[PDB]
Each structure stands twice: as C-alpha cells, then as structure tokens.
C-alpha cells in the first residue's frame, strides 16, 4: 500500500515531467544580469535560440540540447 | 602525354611524334596513360583491345 | 521445443551477421554462433625453453609469444573436445575456471 493521494516530495522531484499528479514542467524563468551594461534580461531556461542583448551585442546563451549554458559570470534567480 | 599524369584517359593519339593521330580513333574508345619514365621519354598506354 | 532460449548464438538485435570460416572443416558459421577461443602460447615448447636458454646469445630478454584468435564451428569442436555437453540446469552456467 502506497499513498498516491499524498506522495513523498522526494519522489515528486525525482519522477518524470508528466508521470506525477499535477504535471507541472521542470523548466523555469531566469533573470540574467548582463555583464556589459546593466540590463536584467528575462530569459527561458531551455532556450533554443541564441540570446542577444539588444544593447551590448554580446552572446548570452549558447543553446544546447537540454538547457543552455551561459557566457561568463551571469547569475540567475527563480521566480513564479 | 608527358604533361598528363598516369591514369589519364585520352583518345586520338600519335604512335610516332608528328603523324597527326593514329591510335584509338573509332567511335566510343579511349587509350589510358600509365607509368612514365623521366629519362628516355617513354610511356605505357593501354589500347582499347588490351594491348599495353 | 526450444533447447535454448538464445537459440545457441547471441544475435538478438541484428538481422544478419557475417559468416566466418571454421579452421578444421572450413564451414562458414555466423561469428557469434561459432565456438571462439584464443590461444596464447609460448612459441617454444615449455620443456624446450631451457635448451634455447642454454645457447641463447642474449641474456634471456627475448621471450616471443604467439597469439591466435582460434575459431571453431560446433559440428567439429565437439569432436575436437572443447565444448563438452552438460545438463538442463548446467546449461545456465558461464565462464569455466
């Protein structure tokens, strides 16, 4: 017997994107503080295109299968 | 034929230098150039029969 | 019936594997189905090592080995005393010591 009504959060983090009960995704939105000028740029986690900041003309994200890697020393936060 | 490398596929050549075309003249044929000697300027060719 | 689950060989994903000749009777056999071994031998008789160790020019530093991927088919390997038969629960075994 297993409580499917109230499962363990350790299980809920481990299980797949869509196996669990509420089926929320695993991606997030991250705010990148640009090294060049000042600008905070809202960017998606699993971005597919290159992300150019409109002022500084420096490449933020090299898009990769999975989640993109950043350029150099750019923090991020979790917001919902 | 001294200019061309071996493996060159030609047609309408001279046997002796200066008789304006004798070998491999018929329709749809070719001679093939192989094995140059630098000194004593000679060259092997394959004729369309199989004569080297 | 099935005598074996794997049908003898080890092809499962494939549709066709190359054949390789046997050494004895020269029959082509798919190269997982064949009985495969590998003879590492001293190229001298191990009893005859000492005769060459007597009159060897160098200081016994040359020690040549002969390596052969040896490759049998099952129809002659059993006759040539390699793959001797077993029991029902003894077919489930792996590598001999």
């Amino acid at each position: 017997a297993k409580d499917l009504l109230h499962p363990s959060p350790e299980e809920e983090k481990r299980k797949h994107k869509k196996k669990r009960l509420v089926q929320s995704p695993n991606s997030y939105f991250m705010d990148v503080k640009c090294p060049g000028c000042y600008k905070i740029t809202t960017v998606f986690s699993h971005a597919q295109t290159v992300v150019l900041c409109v002022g500084c003309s420096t490449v933020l994200c090299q898009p990769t299968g999975g989640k993109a890697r950043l350029t150099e020393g750019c923090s991020f936060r979790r917001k919902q | 034929v001294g200019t061309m490398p071996e493996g060159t596929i030609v047609c309408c050549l001279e046997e002796k230098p200066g008789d304006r075309g004798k070998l491999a003249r018929a329709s749809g044929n070719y001679a093939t150039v192989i094995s140059h000697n630098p000194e004593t300027k000679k060259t092997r060719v394959k004729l369309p029969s199989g004569s080297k | 019936t099935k005598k074996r689950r794997n049908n003898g060989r080890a092809k499962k994903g494939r549709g066709h594997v190359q054949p390789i000749r046997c050494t004895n009777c020269a029959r082509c056999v798919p190269k997982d189905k064949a009985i495969k071994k590998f003879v590492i031998r001293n190229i001298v008789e191990a009893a005859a090592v000492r005769d060459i160790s007597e009159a060897s020019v160098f200081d016994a530093y040359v020690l040549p080995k002969l390596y052969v991927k040896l490759h049998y088919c099952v129809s002659c390997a059993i006759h040539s005393k390699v793959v001797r038969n077993r029991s029902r629960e003894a077919r489930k075994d792996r590598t001999p010591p």
Binding site: - | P5, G7, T8, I9 | -
Partner: protein
C-alpha cells in the same frame, strides 16, 4: 485511350523481327527520339541529328554527345575522373 499495352514505340515494326530484339530496341529508341533539356539555354528542345550530334532549337548550340542518349555514363565517369586528376596536385 491506351492503344497498345506492351510494345510502346516499337509497334511500328509489327509481328516480325523478334521479341527480344524489339525489347532491346525499345529502351534506346525512346532515348534517341526523346527531347532532352538543354544545359545551355535551359529549354527542352534537344533533338538528335545524325549519330553523335545533338542540337537545340534555341541558340543553335550543337553538342557532340552519345550515339543514342545525350550522355554516356562512361563518359560522365571520364569527365569526373578528368577533373579529379586535373586538380590532383596540378599535373
């Protein structure tokens, strides 16, 4: 309608000259009477002249080609080999 089922262009011969001979003459009579697309002007007005000579109605540009088709596959092989041995180390 479809007036013949098998013989195609070779029906002009009739019941004579033999089955396999008509079978082997079909596949190259279609080739020598087919219009081809000119590689120069881009139109489809190639037509065979006397044997070995091909001609396009636009631009009058006359190309020495195969005896029955526009290019022999052996000749295309020779042209590819000639350009390869050309740019191979510059003679």
């Amino acid at each position: 309608a479809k007036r013949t089922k098998k013989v195609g262009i070779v029906g002009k011969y009739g019941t004579r000259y033999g089955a396999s001979l008509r079978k082997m003459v079909k596949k190259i009579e279609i080739s020598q009477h087919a219009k081809y697309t000119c590689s120069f002007c881009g139109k489809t007005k190639m037509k065979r002249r006397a044997v070995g000579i091909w001609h396009c109605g636009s631009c009058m540009k006359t190309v020495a080609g195969g005896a029955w088709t526009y290019n022999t596959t052996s000749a295309v092989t020779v042209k590819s080999a000639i350009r390869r041995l050309k740019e191979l180390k510059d003679q």
